[PDB]
Design a protein around this ligand. Structure first.
Ligand SMILES: NC(=O)c1ccc[n+]([C@@H]2O[C@H](COP(=O)([O-])OP(=O)(O)OC[C@H]3O[C@@H](n4cnc5c(N)ncnc54)[C@H](OP(=O)(O)O)[C@@H]3O)[C@@H](O)[C@H]2O)c1
Ligand SMILES: NC(=O)c1ccc[n+]([C@@H]2O[C@H](COP(=O)([O-])OP(=O)(O)OC[C@H]3O[C@@H](n4cnc5c(N)ncnc54)[C@H](OP(=O)(O)O)[C@@H]3O)[C@@H](O)[C@H]2O)c1
Ligand SMILES: O=C(O)c1ccccc1C(=O)O
Ligand code: NA
Ligand code: NA
Ligand code: NA
Lengths: 347, 360
């Protein structure tokens, strides 16, 4: 079997990486948990076994076959090159390598073939991008994609364990202590690395990550650029608005597309239902549609509210929901690792 | 001064109507509060005075100059026409009369002129529509509008007092009692009039109102039809997705438009800033943008995240926030009443144009 390292094992994504690995078809002989110096010496479970957390260092990757990185871009930038040098195959969940032309950016249902070209590093895309790609690839295959306009409804677990706990405390202060939402103290959201912090309780924050020079945030531009790379087509026009809402896990997206050919709605529904990783949940006569609360804990991406635009001949609207820590992060990463094993690419 | 009646004075919108009237420039000689027979006989404040709540009936409007209705579409359907026959000018917050060609559908900053043609009923548009019209009218005036695509992020207060209480209760069960969100019992949301009910706590529900035959909801189709009527242009393409989120008050909207002529983006920002009722909050270098929690309690509509589409030359994205019970309902209604007063339009109508539904 393999020796597998989880870098960032103690975080929100890390904890789900552990869960996905425990349930994986990857043959694992040895498991190692890496994090920062302040987590070193603590213990975490793998199934029934206690695993000592180790400090991530430049020489910590000896004997590792596969390393799953989910410890921030800074950690990946610094240590992933040393891992690769030592012969480790790295699956990276951060944004650092995503736009490197020698790094495949992979959603296995959509572009697993790109794994064949890897030179030691595979990048997992952004959580919001991944679920959109699972929903839209089956449509692209049959009728093409001219453009995408998306507005997201993103859960706080995407911003890490600290964000989850800040959200819970804020909500308790309002509901139990009577604090006005605008008077809440905040330290993390919308973005840990930005200057000002705002409450998320009973709010909708139109900022994920920091702003770029074109007044879209890095999150919004990630959806644009990663879509083009994953679908291998720079002609697909993509513009996004990414909003944080008071949901702990599971991202929702209002997705508008225009296809290249008119795609009959019932055929679109059947194409999505037929696509591995996508589940059609769409029966408005019985109020059936994807919901964040029902999607938590499942690896599937759920699609509904599928309907034609009222005016644009080739326009289609839909609602896409997935667990942002599973398919959006830890499951996509482990699924990459399984695909690497299944295709003889752990070399 | 005027005798003013508030129909549905005991509800979520009613509470704000009272506040907006207390703070109004309307010369009010007498206030009447109408609700259901259950509420009739009880009391509520107007400023320091106690007001006895009355039953809403066909004969409850004698002597009233202006009635603000916010007690449900059925109540408006049944009683507004009787108020008009009593000589009352009705400002209706419900959907019932909005698409009637004899009824102006008004956002005063946008189409106050339409008030001149009233026949005793003036309709207030849906809350989601109102804030979007305040944001977009200044753009339409200068560069036109070809199409709008909007996704909403709507607060629970829009669904009434019960929905507010259900939301608070669900959140407390999760946060204080450790109930999983999917195990919560719901009775009201997403729509009181539909058969199935789902939790809102830690959820995003892509259903507001019931579904129509074209697979859009009534809320989504209201945004479509109301936009075309208010802007007096049936050629504006409008398609919406309306989503309830766990916010108590203030609606937010991710709004995409394509103009008829290219609109320079800094001039778009200036046009919105210059438009009465709209406030430009847009300085991303300092993380300045509209937020629901900061808009609650203000009558203004806040607009930011304004930026060009990455590909469509005439495309523009923005983020629009307003208190859904103020500009979205109570304030827009009171503002209509003030505008009627100011333009000498508070007077009985000559001919009845609305079906009487209680002749039995
Ligand atoms: N043992 C301690 O002293 C202690 C006390 C409180 C919290 N923590 C941990 O700190 C994290 C706080 O959560 P969050 O919201 O900031 O982030 P998060 O996104 O949920 O997870 C961040 C992950 O990246 C790891 N990491 C950060 N910098 C690193 C570096 N230079 N090298 C290797 N790994 C690095 C963290 O390890 P670390 O866990 O080592 O930071 C953590 O596993 C939690 O994972 C929590 O377990 C540790
Ligand atoms: N413009 C907008 O977008 C917008 C937004 C919100 C609401 N509205 C309109 O306003 C209505 C109420 O909204 P809300 O949020 O205030 O609801 P709410 O909090 O549930 O209040 C309902 C109100 O309607 C009254 N009512 C119920 N049955 C009645 C009857 N048979 N006769 C007279 N009054 C009756 C209630 O009186 P009791 O206390 O006696 O039952 C109460 O005053 C909505 O149904 C909608 O039509 C419009
Ligand atoms: O459309 C509205 O403003 C509205 C909002 C909430 C409930 C009911 C209605 C209604 O009157 O149909
Ligand atoms: Na294109
Ligand atoms: Na202004
Ligand atoms: Na006058």
């Amino acid at each position: 079997g393999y020796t597998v390292a989880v870098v960032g094992a103690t975080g929100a994504v890390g904890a789900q990486m552990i869960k996905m690995l425990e349930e994986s078809t990857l043959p694992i002989d040895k498991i190692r948990y890496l994090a920062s110096a302040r987590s070193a010496g603590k213990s975490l479970k793998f199934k029934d076994q206690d695993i000592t957390i180790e400090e991530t260092t430049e020489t910590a990757f000896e004997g590792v076959d596969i390393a799953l990185f989910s410890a921030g871009s800074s950690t990946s930038a610094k240590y992933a090159p040393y891992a690769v040098k030592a012969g480790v195959v790295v699956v990276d969940n951060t944004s650092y390598f995503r736009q490197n032309p020698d790094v495949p950016l992979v959603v296995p249902e959509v572009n697993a073939h790109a794994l064949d070209a890897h030179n030691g590093i595979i990048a997992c895309p952004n959580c919001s991008t991944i679920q959109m790609m699972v929903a839209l690839e089956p449509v692209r295959q049959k009728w093409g994609l001219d453009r995408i306009i998306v507005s997201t409804y993103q859960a706080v677990s995407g911003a890490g364990m600290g964000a989850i706990l800040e959200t819970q405390r804020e909500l308790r202060e309002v509901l139990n202590d009577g604090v006005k939402p605008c008077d809440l103290h905040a330290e993390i959201l919308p973005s840990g690395g930005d200057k000002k912090h705002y409450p998320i309780a009973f709010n909708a924050l139109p900022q994920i990550d920091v702003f770029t020079d074109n007044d879209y945030t890095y999150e919004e531009m990630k959806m644009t650029k990663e879509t083009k790379k994953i679908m291998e087509d720079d002609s697909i026009a993509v513009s996004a608005t990414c909003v944080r809402i008071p949901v702990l896990s599971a991202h929702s997206e209002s997705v508008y597309i225009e296809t290249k050919e008119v795609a009959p709605i019932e055929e679109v529904k059947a194409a999505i239902a037929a696509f591995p990783g996508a589940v059609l949940e769409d029966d408005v006569a019985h109020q059936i549609y994807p919901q964040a609360i029902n999607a938590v804990g499942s690896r599937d991406t759920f699609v509904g509210r599928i309907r034609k635009d009222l005016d644009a001949e080739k326009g289609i609207h839909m609602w896409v929901v997935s667990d942002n820590l599973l398919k959006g992060a830890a499951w996509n990463s482990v699924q990459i690792a399984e695909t690497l094993h299944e295709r003889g690419l752990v070399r």
